[PDB]
Amino acid sequence: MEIVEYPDPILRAKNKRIDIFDENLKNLVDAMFDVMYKTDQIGLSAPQVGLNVQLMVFNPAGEPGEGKEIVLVNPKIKKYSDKLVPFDEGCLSFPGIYAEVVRPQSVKIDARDITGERFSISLSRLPARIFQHEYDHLEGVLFFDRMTDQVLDSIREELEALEKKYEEKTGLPSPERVEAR
Numbered sequence: 001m002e003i004v005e006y007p008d009p010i011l012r013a014k015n016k017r018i019d020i021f022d023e024n025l026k027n028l029v030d031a032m033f034d035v036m037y038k039t040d041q042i043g044l045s046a047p048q049v050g051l052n053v054q055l056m057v058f059n060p061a062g063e064p065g066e067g068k069e070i071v072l073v074n075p076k077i078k079k080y081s082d083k084l085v086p087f088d089e090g091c092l093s094f095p096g097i098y099a100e101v102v103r104p105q106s107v108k109i110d111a112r113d114i115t116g117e118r119f120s121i122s123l124s125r126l127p128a129r130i131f132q133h134e135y136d137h138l139e140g141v142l143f144f145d146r147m148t149d150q151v152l153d154s155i156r157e158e159l160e161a162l163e164k165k166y167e168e169k170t171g172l173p174s175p176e177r178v179e180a181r
């Protein structure tokens, strides 16, 4: 398996609603989780593994046998919190890049589970901060789109290194560019 890095367009591509809840789905859930623990992270969205489906795995503790193992298919934010908290974020698809993004502190979420059943879970604190990072991905939103103009300028150069690496492995000009904003 592999980790799709910015600027790969898969990270931007539209993401397919999931209709079937079979064994294949559980296997892919399993793999995401195990990629999350391998890479020491607290969540992961399907596009990050090269699949454009509305799928996201999630453990608030980000440690094996700790926290919980949350699966959310076809999620949607029923609402965001009025209060905004800043906080420092990194993302797997942007190796070694860290910086601040300010977000609603809490969220009401509606998703389905791995079986088919439709639930409605409310999140705050670090879980709601992670959920939101991951759900953006589900929408093709990457955390630097959430960053201030000032925060973006610190990481401009490191984002570029990724564009150039992408250009080096593919030959194709980068399909998107931090300088564009």
Ligand SMILES: CCCCC[C@H](CC(=O)NO)C(=O)N[C@H](C(=O)N1CCC[C@H]1CO)C(C)C
Residues within 6 Å of the ligand: 040, 041, 042, 043, 044, 045, 048, 087, 088, 089, 090, 091, 092, 093, 129, 130, 131, 133, 134, 137
């Ligand atoms: C909080 C926002 C959710 C982060 C998701 C990323 C992984 C990812 O790219 N999901 O798409 C992660 O685990 N990032 C970690 C991260 O941002 N963390 C880990 C614990 C604290 C918080 C940074 O303050 C590190 C390991 C880079």
Ligand SMILES: [Zn+2]
Residues within 6 Å of the ligand: 001, 002
């Ligand atoms: Zn591989």
Ligand SMILES: [Zn+2]
Residues within 6 Å of the ligand: 030, 031, 034
């Ligand atoms: Zn496993």
Ligand SMILES: [Zn+2]
Residues within 6 Å of the ligand: 040, 041, 062, 063
């Ligand atoms: Zn850890």
Ligand SMILES: [Zn+2]
Residues within 6 Å of the ligand: 090, 091, 092, 093, 133, 134, 137
């Ligand atoms: Zn991410």
Ligand SMILES: [Zn+2]
Residues within 6 Å of the ligand: 160, 179
């Ligand atoms: Zn430039």
